[PDB]
Design goal:
Chain A: One of its GO terms (molecular function) is GTPase activity. Chain A: It is found in: Cell membrane; Cytoplasm. Chain A: Keywords: Cell membrane, Cytoplasm, GTP-binding, Hydrolase, Membrane, Nucleotide-binding, Receptor. The complex is a heterotrimer of chains A (265), B (43) and C (290). Chain A is an alpha/beta fold. Chain A has 11 helices and 8 strands. Chain A has an 8-stranded mixed beta sheet, sandwiched between helices. By secondary structure, chain B is mostly helical. Chain B has a single domain, classed as 434 Repressor (Amino-terminal Domain), CATH 1.10.260.30. Chain B starts with a helix and ends in a 7-residue tail after the last helix. By secondary structure, chain C is of the alpha/beta class. Chain C has 2 domains: 87 residues, Four Helix Bundle (Hemerythrin (Met), subunit A); 191 residues, 3-Layer(aba) Sandwich (Rossmann fold). Chain C is 37% helix and 14% strand. Chain C contains 10 helices and 8 strands. In chain C, strand 2, helix 6 and strand 3 form a beta-alpha-beta unit. The N and C termini of chain C lie close together (6 Å). The chains are: A alpha/beta (265), B mainly alpha (43), C alpha/beta (290). Chains in contact: A-C. Chains A and C meet through helix 1 of A and helix 1 of C. The structure holds one RNA strand of 96 nucleotides.
RNA sequence: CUCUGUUGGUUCUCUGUGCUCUGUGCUCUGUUUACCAGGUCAGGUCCGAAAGGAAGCAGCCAAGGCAGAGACGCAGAGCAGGCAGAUGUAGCUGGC
């Protein structure tokens, strides 16, 4: 607990104990402390809150129709798409899924179980096929029939391997072959238990396809997940959604005042 | 992938070219290159 | 040579002046979470920072001129003492019976070929025994690695009693005059009871002196659950840390000694039988923090 | 320098007897031939995301090929071993 209303030496010290335990950064945490010391304000509870909202900011409606969902291993990419299908069907949008996890075992069969529960059709395929061209047949079934949104699924790939990052560039030019305007929105799925490895992941995925939004999962535990602050500082990429569970209805919109309130506790 | 490309040049050769490598001239170098899928500089 | 998290935690205290009691708790919370990224358990990381807290007030870090050079020196000497201290080798008797236990995919058959070449050039005579029957082609794997070094292998049949195995081990170690006996067991879990009750029966009939536990460097938070189950039911007296060739830190060795209290002896750096060097608590002290 | 019967010599084709030599016809068998408009084509490539396709050299196989052992048809050029067969023979010397 941080005591608000004491001396200048104890308020700035207990603030550093809460930020470094929330996975913020190295040069990111050092930049916040130098701005409060040269300000000169008595109300230190509202002074730090106005600085943290400006670091995150550069219903939520997408810019395009086809969205590309990317991520690494152990984050739950297939679990995030199941939450995004419940939020948009209550408003009035026609959503359709696309399976692209044929590299991992039981990955393309996982989205088929959540697709029969939400009554949303999934475009499947055999094991050992290409996930880039299976997304091309999903764009041709959107323009011919009459669907609004489309979510593409990817495989479990790392940032260190160059052989799997060149396969990610083949998914971008596959959707751009049918419709030159698409893709517009590229979302990334990160975890809350990740330390300083999440900063190295965001720089490699922006050089490949180009990120326009970041989503974070597993916020219901002991981890706060403040690894979103150093990404909007250098790359200028905004935040979209937050995940507070494993269920379909567990998806709340991004509120810059509610994320800072739970970070300092 | 360098080892399988070296064996690829020997597999396109005849039994007289493997036992005697000095007879492989300009007319023979183009037959071995087009039969393996490589260039003249690789042979 | 330090890591990303420990380059800013020790780096911000340089050129500021004298510190308070609130600065010590702010630095120790960063070392606690730097261990969790280096594959150490949360219960062991909480008990480590409470040990350094009592040693920091004794050396007087509050009245010191340079705070960054004292905190970095206390964690370097406390981690060195928590891993073993110095390079200690096992006590060699007239008749030695060693045991190699572990998990699935840890490399128990790979470590059995390393200990058969290190003691052969010094003056001791090795002997290999294979008790792995559940895994296919496991008795053939130690036979190919035993011919590479020149040590004879003893193969156990399927469905044999623990009293019949001791009858063939004491017969081959008397005629050929073998002193060092290496027993290679099968891969089993911590929660599986039928396989752990057979291992406790194999310890009672034979009667070993040094029981070595082969643990991998890529083991996460479940490193405390393996070391507690193998000590109370069976009885671990030694630890071996294999696969230190990659980008792994090897923090699973800290979560294993805190609950048992038994020192670590050997370390593996390569997949070849020639790649074996003694455990140095000074080399791993700059790898977990680095 | 009548012809006849037994009987004697060359140059004809030929028809049959079975041999032997060559070309073949093609075929059989051993051996020979890098690429130069054959078939199948391991790798290794390329075209694709893939599914699926293509060129394509070795090899081999085929085709060209070089030679003998083949039953022999179909045939000409050969000798001397053949008792010997079918319609003419022309010159010279004999014997009847």
């Amino acid at each position: 607990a941080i005591p608000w209303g004491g001396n200048l030496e104890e308020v700035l010290e207990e603030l550093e104990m809460a930020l470094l335990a929330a996975d913020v950064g190295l040069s990111a945490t050092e930049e916040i402390l130098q701005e409060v010391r040269a300000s000169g304000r008595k109300d230190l509870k509202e002074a730090v809150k106005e600085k943290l909202v400006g670091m995150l900011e550069p219903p939520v409606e997408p810019k395009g129709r086809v969205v590309l969902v990317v991520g690494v291993n152990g984050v739950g990419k297939t679990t995030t798409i199941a939450k995004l299908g419940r939020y948009y069907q209550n408003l009035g949008k026609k959503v359709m899924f696309c399976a692209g996890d044929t590299f991992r075992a039981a990955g393309g069969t996982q989205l088929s179980e959540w697709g029969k529960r939400l009554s949303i059709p999934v475009i499947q395929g055999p094991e050992g096929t290409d996930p880039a061209a299976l997304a091309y047949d999903a764009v041709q079934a959107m323009k011919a029939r009459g669907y609004d949104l489309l979510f593409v699924d990817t495989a479990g790939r790392l940032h260190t391997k160059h052989n799997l990052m060149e396969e990610l560039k083949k998914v971008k030019r596959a959707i751009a072959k049918a419709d030159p305007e698409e893709p517009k929105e590229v979302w990334l799925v990160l975890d809350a238990v990740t330390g300083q490895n999440g900063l190295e992941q965001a720089k490699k995925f922006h050089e490949a396809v180009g990120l326009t939004g970041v989503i974070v999962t597993k916020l219901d535990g002991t981890a706060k997940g403040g690894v979103l602050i150093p990404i909007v500082r250098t790359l200028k990429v905004p935040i979209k959604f937050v995940g507070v569970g494993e269920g379909p209805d567990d998806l709340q919109p991004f509120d810059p005042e509610a994320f800072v309130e739970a970070l300092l506790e | 992938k360098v080892l399988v490309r070296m064996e690829a040049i020997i597999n396109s050769m005849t039994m007289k070219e493997r036992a005697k490598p000095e007879i492989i001239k300009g007319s023979r170098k183009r037959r071995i290159a087009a039969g393996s899928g490589m260039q003249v500089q690789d042979v | 040579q330090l890591s990303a998290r420990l380059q800013e935690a020790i780096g911000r205290l340089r050129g500021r002046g004298r510190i308070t009691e609130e600065d010590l708790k702010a630095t120790l919370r960063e070392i606690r979470r730097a261990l969790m990224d280096a594959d150490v358990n949360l219960e062991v990381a909480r008990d480590f920072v409470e040990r350094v807290r009592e040693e920091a007030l004794g050396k007087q870090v509050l009245e010191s001129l340079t705070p960054a050079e004292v905190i970095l020196a206390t964690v370097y000497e406390a981690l060195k003492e928590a891993l073993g201290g110095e390079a200690r080798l096992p006590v060699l008797k007239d008749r030695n019976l060693w045991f190699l236990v572990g998990l699935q995919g840890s490399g128990k058959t790979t470590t059995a070929a390393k200990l058969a070449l290190y003691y052969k050039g010094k003056g001791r005579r090795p002997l290999l025994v294979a008790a792995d029957t559940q895994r296919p082609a496991a008795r053939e794997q130690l036979r190919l690695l035993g011919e590479k070094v020149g040590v004879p292998v003893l193969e156990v049949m399927d469905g044999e009693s623990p009293e019949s195995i001791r009858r063939r081990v004491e017969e081959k170690a008397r005629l050929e005059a073998r002193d060092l006996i290496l027993v290679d067991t099968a891969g089993r879990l911590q929660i599986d009871e039928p396989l752990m009750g057979e291992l406790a029966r194999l310890k009672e009939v034979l009667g070993p002196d040094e029981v070595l536990l082969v643990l991998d460097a890529m083991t996460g938070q479940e490193a405390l659950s393996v070391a507690r189950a193998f000590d109370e039911k069976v009885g671990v007296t030694g630890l071996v840390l294999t696969k230190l060739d990659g980008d792994a830190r090897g923090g699973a060795a800290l979560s294993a000694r805190h609950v048992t209290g038994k020192p670590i002896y050997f370390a593996g750096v390569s997949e070849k039988p020639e790649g074996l060097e003694p455990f140095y608590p000074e080399r791993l002290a700059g790898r977990i923090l680095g």
